[PDB]
Structure formats: structure tokens, C-alpha cells
Design an enzyme around this catalytic site. Structure first.
Site: not given
Ligand code: ADP
Ligand code: MG
Ligand code: ATP
Ligand code: MG
Lengths: 523, 539
Positions: B154, B180-181
Site C-alpha cells: 500500500k 503509520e511508521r
Molecule cells: N511496487 C512494489 N514493487 C516491488 N516490491 C514491492 C512493491 N510494493 C511492495 N513491495 C514489497 O512488499 C513490501 C510491502 O510494501 P509496503 O508498501 O510497505 O506494504 P504495506 O504498506 O501494505 O505493509 C515492501 O517492503 C517490498 O518488499
Molecule cells: Mg504502510
């Protein structure tokens, strides 16, 4: 019954004085006749109304703060949690069998604090800072609050230093960072503490190798565990030498519920000394699923209304304000860091539990440990399809980042064909070749317990599996095959790989040359 | 005149007033606290007592501590002076660069715009993401929800929406970090200095984004009100400045979660799964303020965390009605390595309509969802049979849908720091024609995984050139490679000698700055006079 005519009744309307003139000279000889049973009135001190189950309701204590250390007359400490209009709810830091109704409660004036500093480095303390190792009191130490707020946006910087754990299932697939909060989640007896102990043991091997400022000072917080498990763990940390850099906070299962609730905050304040002074900390909140049960016991007995699984409503804030204190500070704040490894135990693999889904949303990464991969020989039982990390690149070894990129990729092709291994057709040599190589990569990540591996010896062992040099080895003796790759390969290739950080093409030749000079015993 | 603290139970404070109680939602200041503690009146308890939620921690609060009334709700700075600044829940600057020089400070509590001042026009906001712009196209001035669990992407998706849309927007944007973080609130701040969306110093007024942050370390009173603080900045740029605004709200779920952490302490018996009884009207009171009026426009992108990947949880299920577009991110798509992990079926938009986007964009969108639903119904019988007897009509709808799943993935500009490949911006007309060829059958000539992590249809067509060069490599294994030593490779003993000497001082740096104060072995308490004394020797 309205307050207008009720406060009108403050004005005198007696219109006769045949009791006011009579009992005024009769009251003081009547009060003095029963003054043996009168306890003295209390204003700024406290007096226990009711005590039970570790909760004292305290009359008086007019000027206490919320969250303040109070002290009963029997010597046991307390904490004013909910300040109500007629009393104060105090959680008792210890056994409430020494507290009676009518005991004097004394305000200590201070918010709850623990001793922090270099004097805690090597000690076993309880959930409030008192040393339980029997080595005398804490010297060369100072007091600091357990409820420091987390460093904000302008105080932090991006997580760039690695902090290797010594577990190559972790350090290749789910790379930790230096200020990163990474969850170790799994069922009971799946190797949760093992992954965290191997991290602490590996820092002792690295602290005798780095120049005085990349040294990592560990803090182990043992919440809710039994006392013999903690003593089994100091014995491991002393015989390894890891206890020189390790603090141990242990609020065990026999301790009171506000001691296990406060021990992650007590241990984080001790680990915040190294973050706030330019050093690097590493905290393990082992059984953070047991802190929430201890916090649930206090709030249900303070008569706060229960929620999901009878937990308090603010049990997300219990763990979010704790874990956000693990940060990587900016250069104007010293550049120090603090990385957290909280441990959550699930029930029958139910990741959808209430405390489990909170800490997953708080922490950066997850280390999922499945009990069915644990009994297939995969130790540590890392679920690669479920264990993610927020940092990805720029927080691992640059030499590992070349050879673990083609391992995370190529293990995905191994799992996509394992749901197609019941038929045995194995057409066009594609779903069978990756089934032979992907099975040779999961056996690479298997390692022992209490024996962490340096990162130069990890990026050579997985160099030898994603590339060639192990293509004709049976899948039953790869675990012994790396002992050829680590010992019989000339150990000066590890020194130049540790100092460079990446696999240079001048070293990519010697890593391909010296991996053909070894004789693997697989036959 | 003023009030005093009557009761502190957690983050909820009861304040008693001797006449002239403050209004509900009004702001109260606590006098004598260590930091600025702000209480917002939640209800009137009845015996001249109001019940409040605190914007900071309630540690240190004394019963009888003086509480003054501001006579108004929480007012925050709004305007051009907040652009390029990081704000608190109560409008304090937490970026350590002076005070906020903004005029006409605004209350964070207003009602929704009325039914008459609602716009009905539907223009497509082109994103650059070929799963967004094809299957669930966004609307400029509309409300976008990025659903998905923890770790599905997200925040990376909302970061690609910032550098694609909010950089080339012209108007102002507002990021509202709700619960959030703080690490990723610092990563957003630092990479908008580098991209130039936030400028510091004398060129501060040329910034284009106001940051309002209410992250996870804040108490649940601050997390429950910071989504109104950032919305008030977005409502000033819409109403008074007349501009088009981009309101990015990271995890509007944390608005509903923070109201749940105080709900039982406000004296409300709980509803279903564990949320407050006012879950649909607290969320509906916030979402209806984020609208496009006739004065200006607000294009909102909201991340919505679903708990444990459950879309039937009542906090994400209430959000679905408030959204024009909906991007449901799935863990099953992410576990196949496809990023962005958008569920191509579960994602829905109001713009997916042939009267809005045209019958050529619409039919290739429904054609992709037809072949992807047919593949989801065929994967039942593939694991039982093997997909070898389907007579090449169902093997064609498998081979085309498997090319489409890879071609929905895309490299992101904000994701190249942990993947390596640079991001691709795909135009709208370049993904409609690209998905038409895979649908009608122009690109069965190409291999299946050539569609993986590319941009345009002219990149998969050239990835099949590189993929069939490099498998025509690995043919020579004899010699003339890097492993022979006489070319430019020094000896392994000589390579060790270029290691620079690193020193170790063997003292671990602990005896240089520490104020090792004395800690008393005795316990030290306060008597009835408030004076510090030892504990009296009587149990
Ligand atoms: N667009 C993307 N391309 C590649 N890897 C991604 C992407 N989005 C997420 N990831 C991988 O998955 C993880 C989840 O992304 P993040 O935005 O932090 O998710 P959430 O906010 O839903 O927990 C990232 O840390 C990365 O390792
Ligand atoms: Mg997040
Ligand atoms: N890599 C490993 N190789 C071999 N055995 C291992 C490994 N990791 C853990 N174990 C063993 O697995 C068992 C459980 O490990 P551990 O104590 O870390 O689990 P746990 O999840 O903390 O369990 P508990 O719920 O009892 O605290 C122990 O017998 C331990 O020695
Ligand atoms: Mg354990």
C-alpha cells in the site's frame, strides 16, 4: 433534585437552633470517646481502601501524577494507573499479600524509571531494574524514565547499516537493518528464540572485529518465561562471552503482571542509552505475546472494559509506542540506532489473531516460522513466501545482494512447482530442473543452533549454490557439503570479501577457481 | 473561569467546570504540564464534568490540575505558509524550522458540504500504472481507496501515486500520515527534498506539499484527530485558494482504530468485532468532508489497511461505500512476484463505464477481466488433470491470461531502491493498445514471462529479443573467460595486501561521557508536607 436549589441549601434556612446549640458541645466529647478506632486523616499520603489480585485502591494521594511510582509502607512499590475522583487504582510491583486495608501509601514523586548506562551491561535485572543475578547493586549507572516518547521524523534517518544476524536464512532472504523492527512470529517451539539468540551470539563475534563504533549492544527482554529458561540462557551467554555486551531484563512468570507489562519498556530504556549516545543497540522482546496478557490482567482488574479476546482497547498503543522507540537516529543526534526483534507466539498458526495482527502492522518485517516446515528438516523453519522485509536492498551485504537476488527469485520457482509434484510427468526438463536446484537451495539455508555464521562465509556458501559447483550433489548431503566450501577453500578469500563488501570481478574469478579445487564427498 | 482535572483513566481525562462547560469538540489546554497537552471535549458527563481525549500522553496529570478553555475547537495553521512544512495534530511544526507563518488559522471540525454543492463531472486521472489505468481507472476529484493487508504494497503504491500524479499536478498536495511508521514518514520527507516537492529556507514558498503527521507513537487521541488536521489544510486550498488538492491519507484505518482505543473509556458498550458503536458515522463524518465542491476539487488517495487480509472486517467494509475508485491489493498476487499486487477482479472504479472512458477502453478492460476470471475457474481442474487435454481453446485462455498477469505488473520508480530495475511510466493509450494485442492474440509470438516487469508493449517485444539472445548464450564452456589468472587477475595473496589497516581500541567507548550518578539503595518518598523523606520504618 436540581443543583440550583441544592446549592441554595448551602445558605442557612434552619429557623431554629435546638440541635445546633445542643450537639455542638456534645460532638467533641463524643468523637474523643471513639478516637481509638479513628485512623488519622490522610490528604497527600495514601491509605489502602481495598487490595486484591495485585490491585490496590488507594484513598487520598491528592497530588499524585498518572503513571507515578508510589510506595506502600511495607516497602513494595506501586504505580498510579487510573486516577479516579475518590480513589487511585495502583498496580502492585510484587506480591500484594503484604498490603492490608489501611496501610499508608507514600508518593515517591517520580514517574517510573530504571537504571540505564554502562553499568547494566552484563547484568541480569528484573522488570524494574533491580539486579537478580546476585552480583551486588548497579554501579556506574543513572536513572531514566521508561516512557520516553519515540524520536520523530526530523530525528531519524534512513536505515542503511546491515546488522547481520548470522542466520543465512535471514541474512540472504529477509535482510535486517540497523534501526529496523523485525517480527519473529511463529507457533510454540518453532525456533523463535533460537533466531534471536543466534543474533546476540553473532554480535559478540562481530564486536571483537569492528572499530569501536559499529559494535552492537544486545538487550534480551524475557517476558513471562520461566526462571530456569532464563538461567539456561545466561549460562549460554556467559560461556560464549556474549554477556559482555548483553543486558538481560527478565520479568518471569512468577512476577506480578505490572512487572511483565513494564519489562519491555524497562529493557527499551536500557537499550535507548546506546541509541542516544551514538552506539548501536539490539533489543529482543521475547514473548511480546505474553506482555499483552500481563497488560490484559491489569486492565481487567482495574475494571477497564474488555474488547477483542478481552484485551484492552489500547493494546495496539501498548506495542506501537514500544516498538517505535527502535529507530536509527540522525547525524545531529549521534547517528546511533536501535533495532527491535519482538517475538509473538501464534496459536495453531493463526496469524489472524488480535495481538499478532497488531505487531505485524507495527513492525517493518516478519520472520514467519511454521511448525510444518520445522519437521521437514528445515531449521530455521523460515517461510520464504510469507517472510518479508521493508528495507530490501541498501541494508544487506553488497556481496550477498548479488548472490541472494538469484536465490529469492529461484526459490519462488521451486514453490510454484511443489503444488505440481503429485503426478510425476515432469515435462520438458523445466519443472524438474528447478525442482532439483530449488531443493538444493532450501538445504543450503539449513543450519545448526547456537552457531552463527559470518556474512563472508554466508555469501560464499550461497555463491556456490545459485551458481554451479553443486549441481551434481545429492540433496541428502548438502549440509555437510558446505564444510568443504568453508574450510577447504583458502580462508584469505573471506578476508578480502569482508573488507571489500562486494564480490569484485577480480574476486569472482578466484571464487570460481577455488570452488573447483575442493572435493565434495557427495557420491 | 477554568476547570480542573477530575479523573485520568488512560488517554481519557475528565475535567470538571464550576459553571460554563465548554462545548463538545472544543479544545482545552492543561496548565502546568511538561509539554503542551491539549484535550478535546468528547462528551458532557453530566455533573458539571466534561470527558476528553488527550492529544499527547497523560503521564504527569494530577487530579486538580488547572485546565483552561480555548472557547473553540482545535485550530491549526492553514494556507501557503504550511506548504513544505510538517505539522502536528494540533498544528505545531515538528520539522524544526521556525514557526508556521500561516494566516487565518482554521478549526479542524466542520460539517460536510451540502448536497447542492456537489460536482458530478467524471474526468479520468491518468496514473501511469497499467493495472490502475486499465481495469479500475481513477477519477480526478474522486476518492481512491488502496485496500490490502500488511506488506502487500500500500505504501509503495501510494508513493508511486505521489511522484506520478502529485509532481505533475500544478496544484497543491497534502499528505496526512495517520497512525503509520515514523520511519516511512521520514522517508517521505527526505525524498521530497530531493525531488523538489518540499523546498527549505528562502524558497519554502515554492513547495507543493503540506505534511501532517500523526504516527504510531502518538496516543489514540492524536491518531484519531490528525486525519482532520490534514483535511483542514486540504479544505483551505479547495475553498479559499480555489485550487485542486491532492489529499494522500496513509491508513485511514488508523482513524477508525484510534477511536476504538478510547471508545470503552468514553463509556460506550462495544459493537461488532470490537470497534466503536459509531464506526460508520465517525468514518462517514470524515469521508464526506473530502469531496469535490463547486469552489475547488480534492482528489483523495487513501490507503486502507485490512486486518489479516480480511475485506469483510467492518472497518474496511465501511470505507467501500465512500470511494469512487477501489484498488484492492492482494497477498496472492504478491506471492507470485507480481507487483503492484492489485487484484484485477476485486478492484472496481466508477469510471469503468463505456459512457465515460469510451467503449474501446471499456471492452479491453472487460476482456481482461473475462479471461482472468476464466483462468481462475480453470485452475481448479488444472491441478487435478494437468492442462494437457483442454483442446487448445481452454489452453489458449490459460496462455493469454498468464501473459496478462505478468503484463499487469510494472516496475515502479519508488521501488527501484529495493528491486534494481528502473521504473516505467505507461501512458493511457499505450496500455489499451498493449492489452488489446494480448487479448485478440497479436502477442502469442512472445514468451510468457517476457511480459513480466516491463512498461509498454514495445518493451516486452524487446525483452523477447534479450531473452532469446541470453539463452543462446551459455553455449561455450572451454576457455577465454574470466577464470584464467594471467589476464588482469592478481594473486589471492596479493589481493589481501591492499586491505587498509582498521584499528581496534578495545575499550568499547563507555568511560568518556557518562554522568554516573548515585542511585539510592533506600527508597525515598514524600510525606504529608510534600517534603522528601526516607520511607518510615514501620510496615
Ligand atoms: N511496487 C512494489 N514493487 C516491488 N516490491 C514491492 C512493491 N510494493 C511492495 N513491495 C514489497 O512488499 C513490501 C510491502 O510494501 P509496503 O508498501 O510497505 O506494504 P504495506 O504498506 O501494505 O505493509 C515492501 O517492503 C517490498 O518488499
Ligand atoms: Mg504502510
Ligand atoms: N536451527 C535449529 N536447529 C536445530 N534445532 C533447532 C533449531 N532452532 C531451534 N531448534 C530447537 O527447536 C526447539 C524449539 O526452539 P525454541 O526454544 O527457539 O522455540 P520457541 O518457539 O521459543 O519455543 P517455546 O514456545 O517453548 O518458547 C528447541 O529444542 C531448539 O533447540
Ligand atoms: Mg522461547
Amino acid at each position: 433534585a436540581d443543583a440550583k436549589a441544592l446549592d441554595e441549601l448551602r445558605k442557612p434556612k434552619f429557623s431554629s437552633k435546638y440541635l445546633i446549640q445542643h450537639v455542638s458541645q456534645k460532638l467533641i466529647p463524643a468523637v474523643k470517646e471513639w478516637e481509638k478506632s479513628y485512623q488519622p486523616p490522610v490528604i497527600h499520603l495514601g491509605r489502602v481502601l481495598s487490595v486484591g489480585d495485585g490491585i490496590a485502591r488507594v484513598y487520598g494521594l491528592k497530588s499524585v501524577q498518572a503513571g507515578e511510582l508510589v510506595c506502600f509502607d511495607s516497602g513494595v512499590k506501586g504505580m498510579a494507573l487510573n486516577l479516579q475522583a475518590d480513589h487511585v487504582g495502583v498496580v502492585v510491583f510484587g506480591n500484594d499479600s503484604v498490603i492490608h486495608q489501611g496501610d499508608l501509601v507514600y508518593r515517591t514523586g517520580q514517574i517510573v524509571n530504571v537504571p540505564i548506562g554502562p553499568g547494566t551491561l552484563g547484568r541480569v535485572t528484573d522488570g524494574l531494574g533491580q539486579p537478580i543475578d546476585g552480583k551486588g547493586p548497579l554501579t556506574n549507572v543513572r536513572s531514566s524514565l521508561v516512557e520516553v516518547k519515540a524520536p520523530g521524523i526530523i530525528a531519524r534517518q534512513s536505515v542503511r547499516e546491515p546488522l547481520f544476524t548470522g542466520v543465512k536464512a535471514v541474512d540472504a532472504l529477509v535482510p535486517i537493518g540497523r534501526g529496523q523492527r523485525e517480527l519473529i512470529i511463529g507457533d510454540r517451539q518453532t525456533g523463535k528464540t533460537a533466531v534471536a539468540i543466534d543474533a546476540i551470539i553473532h554480535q559478540k563475534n562481530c564486536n571483537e572485529q569492528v572499530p569501536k563504533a559499529q559494535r552492537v549492544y544486545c538487550v534480551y527482554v524475557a517476558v513471562g518465561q520461566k526462571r530456569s529458561t532464563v538461567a539456561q540462557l545466561v549460562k549460554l551467554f556467559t560461556q560464549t562471552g556474549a554477556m559482555r555486551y548483553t543486558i538481560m531484563v527478565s520479568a518471569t512468570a512468577s512476577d506480578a503482571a505490572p512487572l511483565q507489562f513494564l519489562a519491555p519498556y524497562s529493557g527499551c530504556a536500557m537499550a535507548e542509552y546506546f541509541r542516544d549516545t551514538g552506539k548501536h543497540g539490539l533489543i529482543i522482546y521475547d514473548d511480546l505475546s505474553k506482555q499483552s496478557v500481563a497488560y490484559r490482567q491489569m486492565s481487567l482488574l482495574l475494571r477497564r472494559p474488555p474488547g477483542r479476546e478481552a484485551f484492552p482497547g489500547d493494546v495496539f498503543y501498548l506495542h506501537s509506542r514500544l516498538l517505535e522507540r527502535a529507530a536509527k537516529l540522525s547525524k545531529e543526534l549521534g547517528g546511533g540506532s536501535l533495532t527491535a526483534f519482538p517475538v509473538i507466539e501464534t496459536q495453531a498458526g493463526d496469524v489472524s489473531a488480535y495481538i499478532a495482527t497488531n505487531v505485524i502492522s507495527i513492525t517493518d518485517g516478519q520472520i514467519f516460522l511454521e511448525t510444518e516446515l520445522f519437521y521437514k528438516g528445515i531449521r530455521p523453519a523460515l517461510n520464504v513466501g510469507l517472510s518479508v522485509s521493508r528495507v530490501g536492498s541498501a541494508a544487506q551485504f553488497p556481496g550477498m545482494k548479488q548472490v541472494a537476488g538469484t536465490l529469492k527469485l529461484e526459490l519462488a520457482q521451486y514453490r510454484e512447482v511443489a503444488a505440481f509434484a503429485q503426478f510425476g510427468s515432469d515435462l520438458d526438463a523445466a519443472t524438474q530442473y528447478v525442482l532439483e536446484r530449488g531443493a538444493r537451495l532450501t538445504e543450503m539455508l539449513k543450519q545448526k543452533q547456537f552457531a552463527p555464521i559470518p556474512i563472508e562465509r554466508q555469501t560464499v556458501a550461497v555463491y556456490a549454490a545459485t551458481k554451479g559447483f553443486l549441481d551434481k550433489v545429492r540433496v541428502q548431503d548438502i549440509v555437510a557439503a558446505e564444510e568443504a566450501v568453508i574450510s577447504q577453500v583458502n580462508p584469505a578469500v573471506f578476508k578480502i570479501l569482508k573488507a571489500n563488501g562486494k564480490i569484485t570481478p577480480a574476486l569472482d574469478a578466484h571464487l570460481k577457481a577455488e570452488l573447483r579445487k575442493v572435493k565434495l564427498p557427495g557420491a | 473561569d477554568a476547570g480542573y482535572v477530575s479523573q485520568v483513566i488512560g488517554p481519557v481525562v475528565d475535567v470538571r467546570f464550576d459553571g460554563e462547560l465548554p462545548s463538545i469538540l472544543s479544545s482545552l489546554e492543561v496548565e502546568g504540564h511538561s509539554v503542551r497537552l491539549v484535550l478535546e471535549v468528547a462528551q458532557h458527563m453530566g455533573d458539571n464534568t466534561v470527558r476528553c481525549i488527550a492529544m499527547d500522553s497523560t503521564d504527569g496529570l494530577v487530579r486538580g490540575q488547572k485546565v483552561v478553555d480555548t472557547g473553540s475547537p482545535i485550530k491549526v495553521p492553514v494556507g501557503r505558509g504550511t506548504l513544505g512544512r510538517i505539522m502536528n495534530v494540533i498544528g505545531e511544526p515538528v520539522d524544526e524550522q521556525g514557526p508556521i507563518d500561516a494566516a487565518d488559522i482554521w478549526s479542524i471540525h466542520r460539517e460536510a458540504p451540502e448536497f447542492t454543492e456537489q460536482s458530478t463531472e467524471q474526468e479520468i486521472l491518468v496514473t501511469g500504472i497499467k493495472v490502475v489505468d486499465l481495469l479500475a481507472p481513477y477519477q480526478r476529484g474522486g476518492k481512491i481507496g488502496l485496500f490490502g493487508g500488511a506488506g502487500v504494497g500500500k505504501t509503495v503504491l501510494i508513493m508511486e501515486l505521489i511522484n506520478n500524479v502529485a509532481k505533475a499536478h500544478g496544484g497543491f498536495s497534502v499528505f496526512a500520515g495517520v497512525g503509520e511508521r515514523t520511519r516511512e514518514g521520514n522517508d517521505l520527507y527526505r525524498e521530497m527534498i530531493e525531488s523538489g516537492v518540499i523546498k527549505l529556507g528562502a524558497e519554502r514558498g515554492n513547495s507543493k506539499c503540506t505534511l501532517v503527521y500523526g504516527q504510531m507513537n502518538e496516543p489514540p487521541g492524536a491518531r484519531a484527530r490528525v486525519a482532520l488536521t490534514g483535511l483542514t489544510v486540504a479544505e483551505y486550498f479547495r475553498d479559499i485558494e480555489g485550487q485542486d488538492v491532492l489529499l494522500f491519507v496513509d491508513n485511514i484505518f488508523r482513524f477508525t482504530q484510534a477511536n476504538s482505543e478510547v471508545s470503552a473509556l468514553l463509556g460506550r458498550i462495544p459493537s461488532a468485532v470490537g470497534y466503536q458503536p459509531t464506526l460508520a458515522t465517525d468514518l462517514g463524518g470524515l469521508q464526506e468532508r473530502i469531496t469535490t465542491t463547486t469552489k475547488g476539487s480534492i482528489t483523495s488517495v487513501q490507503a486502507v489497511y485490512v486486518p489479516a487480509d480480511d475485506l469483510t472486517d467492518p472497518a474496511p467494509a465501511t470505507t467501500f461505500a465512500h470511494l469512487d475508485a477501489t484498488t484492492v491489493l492482494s497477498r496472492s498476487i504478491a506471492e507470485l512476484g507480481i507487483y503492484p499486487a492489485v487484484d484485477p477482479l476485486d478492484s472496481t472504479s466508477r469510471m469503468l463505464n463505456p459512457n465515460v472512458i469510451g467503449a474501446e477502453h471499456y471492452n479491453v478492460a472487460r476482456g481482461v477481466q473475462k479471461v482472468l476470471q476464466d483462468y481462475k475457474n480453470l485452475q481448479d481442474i488444472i491441478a487435478i488433470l494437468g492442462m494437457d487435454e483442454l483442446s487448445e481453446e481452454d489452453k489458449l485462455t490459460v496462455a493469454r491470461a498468464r501473459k496478462i498477469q505478468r503484463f499487469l505488473s510494472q516496475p515502479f520508480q519508488v521501488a527501484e531502491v529495493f528491486t534494481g530495475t528502473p521504473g516505467k511510466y505507461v501512458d493511457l493509450a499505450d496500455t489499451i493498445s498493449g492489452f488489446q494485442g494480448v487479448l485478440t492474440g497479436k502477442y502469442d509470438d512472445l514468451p510468457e514471462m517476457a511480459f513480466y516487469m516491463v512498461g509498454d508493449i514495445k518493451e516486452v517485444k524487446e525483452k523477447a529479443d534479450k531473452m532469446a539472445k541470453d539463452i543462446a548464450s551459455r553455449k561455450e564452456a572451454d576457455n577465454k573467460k574470466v577464470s584464467e589468472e594471467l589476464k588482469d587477475i592478481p594473486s589471492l595473496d596479493k589481493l589481501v595486501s591492499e586491505i587498509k589497516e582498521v584499528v581496534i581500541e578495545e575499550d568499547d567507548g563507555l568511560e568518556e561521557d557518562f554522568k554516573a550518578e548515585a542511585l539510592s539503595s533506600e527508597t525515598v518518598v514524600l510525606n504529608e508536607e510534600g517534603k522528601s523523606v526516607p520511607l518510615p520504618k514501620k510496615n
